[PDB]
Amino acid sequence: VAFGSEDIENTLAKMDDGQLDGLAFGAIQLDGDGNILQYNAAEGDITGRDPKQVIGKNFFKDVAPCTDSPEFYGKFKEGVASGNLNTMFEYTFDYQMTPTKVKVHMKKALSYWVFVKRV
Numbered sequence: 403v404a405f406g407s408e409d410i411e412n413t414l415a416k417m418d419d420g421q422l423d424g425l426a427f428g429a430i431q432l433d434g435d436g437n438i439l440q441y442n443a444a445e446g447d448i449t450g451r452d453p454k455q456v457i458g459k460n461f462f463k464d465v466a467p468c469t470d471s472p473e474f475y476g477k478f479k480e481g482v483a484s485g486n487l488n489t490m491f492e493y494t495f496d497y498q499m500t501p502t503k504v505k506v507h508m509k510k511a512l513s514y515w516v517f518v519k520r521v
């Protein structure tokens with residue numbers, strides 16, 4: 403599955419942990435409050451977070467404070483509310499990691515996905 407695929411949520415709906423860990427891009431699944439449900443190996447490779455220990459933490463409050471902004475969190479919340487989350491933008495991740503430019507794709511699951519790749 404490619405980053406930004408039109409039907410990416412269909413493909414990932416079928417996937418187990420190892421399968422998610424085999425993706426070419428970082429993949430995070432959040433509930434509507436931003437708590438982390440899933441977090442793959444590729445994401446940990448970008449961020450330095452241990453995927454096994456971030457599960458259950460709040461993405462916006464505790465893991466990724468730099469994403470607590472209108473440009474990221476605000477877009478998440480709008481898409482949770484509208485029921486149509488499917489949005490793509492550039493961002494920089496810089497909390498407890500080397501500042502790293504990424505592309506982000508947020509999309510509602512068949513739970514909400516946050517997909518990340520380096521740029």
Ligand SMILES: *C(=O)/C=C/c1ccc(O)cc1
Nearest residue numbers: 466467468469495496497
């Ligand atoms: C800004 O603080 C971003 C941090 C971050 C982004 C994504 C991750 O998976 C974890 C940390």
